[PDB]
Design an enzyme around this catalytic site. Structure first.
Site, PDB file in Angstrom:
ATOM      1  N   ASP A 119       0.781   4.934  10.502  1.00 53.80           N
ATOM      2  CA  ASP A 119       0.892   5.027   8.897  1.00 53.80           C
ATOM      3  C   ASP A 119       2.409   4.919   8.425  1.00 53.80           C
ATOM      4  OD1 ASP A 119       2.260   7.549  10.304  1.00 53.80           O
ATOM      5  OD2 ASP A 119       1.546   8.903   8.452  1.00 53.80           O
TER       6      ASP A 119
ATOM      7  N   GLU B 139      -7.170   6.107   1.212  1.00 53.11           N
ATOM      8  CA  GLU B 139      -6.550   6.044   2.434  1.00 53.11           C
ATOM      9  C   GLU B 139      -6.699   4.776   3.337  1.00 53.11           C
ATOM     10  OE1 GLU B 139      -4.738   8.616   3.980  1.00 53.11           O
ATOM     11  OE2 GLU B 139      -5.171  10.284   2.526  1.00 53.11           O
TER      12      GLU B 139
END
Ligand SMILES: CCCCCCc1cccc(NC(=O)[C@H](N)CCP(=O)(O)O)c1
Ligand SMILES: *[C@@H]1O[C@H](CO)[C@@H](O)[C@H](O)[C@H]1NC(C)=O
Length: 442
Positions: free
Chosen positions: A220, A211
């Site tokens: 993101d 991540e």
């Protein structure tokens, strides 16, 4: 005459009651101790012959073998100077005959301490200071084991003499029993701490890669604003809407900039929510209950990306994880949409479901994991051989002369503590095959 004459031994082995009560078995143990000598010689010979074994932890493992090596010596001499020959010894020779066992015990206990403390520093991370710790260990051992030779005995206090050790004072045995059990207690509480905290630390480093950690608010690949280890703040395309969520999820006015701990403490929340998301789904809970700690954490990584329904959408693969046929499960997931969206991310997760080890994220996380298991068993066998003696010793402290009869046959307990010195070299070549392949290499 000097209180270093052969009459004191007779007098003290009289008051206890093992003077007239006297019984081939010795020559057998004398030979068994020679096996314990060699068993620990190879431990000290292989750690000196292996370049990968010139690591700090192995020096403490070797010092432990040196303690148990000199124990096998001190007990061969004990067998040769026991029974009928006990009376051909001076009180000083006697305090030297038994003092060598206490020095060999004291050194062994602090060796386990040094190994247990050399584990806690693997996660929370120095060569001269080590042969300074090893030197300190044996100096502290000689001081504790030498206290009766230096005067703390019962040569005039027959009323205070131990039954299993007729020249040792009950207050000295009460002290040794207490100090060493408190150390052995502290070591057991330390390995449990190291075991569970690394269990969390491994999850923290796994997702630190899959991540990626961040202290400043980013966006993101989908678009929505995120922080730290993949913590989604809001789906809203406003930065101040994300800052609203972050300054409330942490408390202080961060302005998008958080701390290392604040990121880690926010991370565990998404781990807790991921774990709860598995313990509330009938297609995830049996899978989780059947998985090992490494694959339990591997499932938590998939849930940390898709979610409860997102990972539930892989029943054809989850069923394979329940039947323990990892190989087919690794193939179906590689062909699914998840291994195509984030490919290198899934690649590492699938390698962990295939192997069942962290040899996909960090190089030294399987061999160190195998040592933790073995290193604890070394203590588990140690505490299992000395505890019967330590209990009998603790009984004698509170027993009156010729009252407690189990004390007059303590040799069963004493030899269990002696044979403990030969269990450690065998325990290495069996449980930790990393060591076993270096021994057979000789
Ligand atoms: C709490 C500290 C315990 C240290 C135990 C020291 C120890 C361990 C193992 C053996 C021995 N010594 C003996 O067994 C002796 N032969 C005692 C028997 P005896 O003196 O002949 O009555 C002594
Ligand atoms: C010591 O043994 C002798 C006989 O060998 C005897 O005088 C006495 O009963 C014993 N001592 C004690 C303190 O019981």
């Amino acid at each position: 005459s000097d209180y270093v004459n052969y009459d004191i031994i007779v007098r003290h082995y009289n008051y206890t009651g093992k003077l007239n009560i006297s019984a081939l078995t010795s020559v057998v143990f004398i030979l068994i101790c020679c096996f314990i000598i060699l068993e620990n010689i190879f431990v000290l010979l292989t750690i000196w012959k292996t370049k990968k074994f010139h690591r700090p932890m192995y020096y403490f493992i070797g010092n432990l073998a040196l303690s148990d090596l000199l124990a096998g010596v001190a007990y061969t001499a004990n067998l040769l100077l026991s029974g009928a020959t006990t009376y051909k010894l001076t009180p000083a020779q006697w305090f030297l005959r038994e003092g060598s066992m206490f020095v060999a015990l004291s050194a062994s206990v602090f060796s386990l301490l040094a190994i247990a403390i050399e584990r806690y520093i693997t996660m929370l991370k120095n060569n001269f200071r080590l042969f300074l710790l090893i030197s300190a260990c044996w100096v502290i051992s000689l001081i504790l084991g030498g206290l009766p030779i230096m005067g703390w005995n019962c040569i005039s206090a027959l009323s205070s003499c131990s039954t299993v050790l007729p020249l040792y004072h009950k207050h000295y045995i009460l002290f040794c029993t207490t100090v060493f059990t408190l150390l052995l207690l502290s070591i057991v509480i330390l390995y449990c701490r190291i075991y569970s905290l690394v269990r969390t630390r491994n999850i923290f480093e796994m997702l630190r890669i899959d991540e990626g950690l961040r202290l400043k608010i980013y966006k993101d690949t989908e678009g929505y604003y995120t922080i730290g280890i993949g913590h989604l703040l809001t789906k809203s395309p406003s930065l101040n809407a994300a800052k609203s969520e972050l300054d409330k999820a942490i408390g202080r006015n961060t302005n998008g900039v958080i701390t290392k701990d604040e990121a880690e403490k926010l991370f565990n929340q998404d781990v807790d929510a991921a774990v709860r998301g598995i313990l509330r789904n009938a297609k995830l809970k049996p899978v989780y209950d059947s998985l090992d700690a490494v694959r339990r954490a591997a499932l938590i990584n998939m849930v940390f990306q898709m979610g409860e329904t997102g990972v539930a959408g892989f029943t054809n693969s989850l069923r394979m994880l329940q039947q323990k046929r990892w190989d087919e499960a690794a193939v179906n997931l590689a062909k699914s949409r998840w291994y195509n969206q984030t490919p290198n991310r899934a690649k590492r997760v699938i390698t962990t479901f295939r192997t069942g080890t962290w040899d996909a994220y960090a190089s030294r996380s399987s061999e160190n994991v195998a040592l933790l298991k073995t290193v604890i068993i070394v203590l588990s066998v140690f505490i299992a051989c000395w505890a019967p003696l330590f209990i009998l010793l603790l009984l004698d402290v509170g027993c009156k002369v010729k009252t407690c009869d189990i004390l007059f046959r303590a040799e069963y307990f004493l030899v269990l503590a002696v044979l403990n010195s030969g269990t450690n070299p065998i325990i290495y070549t069996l449980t930790n095959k990393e060591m076993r392949r270096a021994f057979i290499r000789i």
